[PDB]
């Protein structure tokens, strides 16, 4: 998660995070691509019937 990792449960820092902005969203799309792939690696092997 973007916000909770760095300064979780601190609203005085969450507004500061908006200064950098779209930096962490790039991380979420990077880690989500890995997770979707892991479900396809298993499908290619065992589902050949």
């Amino acid at each position: 998660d973007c916000t909770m990792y760095i300064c979780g449960d601190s609203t005085e820092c969450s507004n500061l995070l908006l200064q950098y902005g779209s930096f962490c969203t790039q991380l979420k799309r990077a880690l989500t691509g890995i997770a979707v792939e892991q479900d396809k690696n298993t499908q290619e092997v065992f589902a050949q019937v």
């Binding site: 998660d1 909770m4 449960d9 609203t11 979420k28 989500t32």
Partner: protein, 48 residues
């Protein structure tokens, strides 16, 4: 919430991840210990 997480007004079919489930801070309090060791100024204030 999921419409404004993706910054768009149309979302395609699928599963999406959004903001979390955390309780907003309602109040605020303070605590400190002090039950003994009182300063004895009464002797000055009770001396004839």
């Amino acid at each position: 919430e999921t419409k404004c997480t993706l910054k768009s007004f149309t979302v395609e079919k699928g599963i999406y991840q959004t903001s979390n489930f955390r309780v907003q801070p309602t109040e605020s309090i303070v605590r400190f210990p002090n039950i003994t060791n009182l300063c004895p100024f009464d002797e000055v204030f009770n001396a004839t």
